[PDB]
Ligand binder design. Structure first.
Ligand SMILES: *[C@@H]1O[C@H](CO)[C@@H](O)[C@H](O)[C@H]1NC(C)=O
Length: 119
C-alpha cells in the first residue's frame, strides 16, 4: 500500500501518495528531500515549468493500490526538462546527472509502459 508524501515541494501535484524506494534508490523520503536541495537553486531560477513535477516523479514516484510498481516520468518530459535546465547547470560547471538519464524512463505512456507525461 501507498504512503503520504512528506516532501513539501512535492505537494499539490496530481497525486499525493508514494512508495519508497524511489527511482534513485532512497528508502527514506527525508533522504530524498535532502538530495532535492541540490536543485532548489534551479527551482527558483525557473529554467522549466516542469522541473518540479519531473523531480518529484523521480524522488517520490506515484503509487496506487491498484498497481504494484512505482510510476515515474515519461522520457519526453525528462528530455524537455533536461534541454531547458542542463545549460544552467553547465554555466556553473555541472552536468545533468546519470541518475536522471532520460533513457531510464519509458519513452511514452502506453499499454506496455506506464508513466506520467506531466503538465
Ligand atoms: C544514458 O544512458 C545510455 C544507455 O542507457 C548511454 O548510452 C548514455 O551515454 C547515457 N548518458 C547520456 C545520454 O548522457
Amino acid at each position: 500500500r501507498c504512503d503520504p508524501i512528506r516532501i513539501s515541494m512535492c505537494q499539490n501535484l496530481g497525486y499525493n501518495v508514494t512508495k519508497m524506494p524511489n527511482l534513485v534508490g532512497h528508502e527514506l523520503q527525508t533522504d530524498a528531500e535532502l538530495q532535492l536541495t541540490t536543485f532548489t537553486p534551479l527551482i527558483q531560477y525557473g529554467c522549466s515549468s516542469q522541473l518540479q513535477f519531473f523531480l518529484c516523479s523521480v524522488y517520490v514516484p506515484m503509487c496506487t493500490e491498484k498497481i504494484n510498481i512505482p510510476i515515474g516520468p515519461c522520457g519526453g518530459m525528462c528530455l524537455s526538462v533536461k534541454r531547458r535546465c542542463e545549460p544552467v547547470l553547465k554555466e556553473f560547471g555541472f552536468a545533468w546527472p546519470e541518475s536522471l538519464n532520460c533513457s531510464k524512463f519509458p519513452p511514452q505512456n502506453d499499454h506496455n509502459h506506464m508513466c506520467m507525461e506531466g503538465p
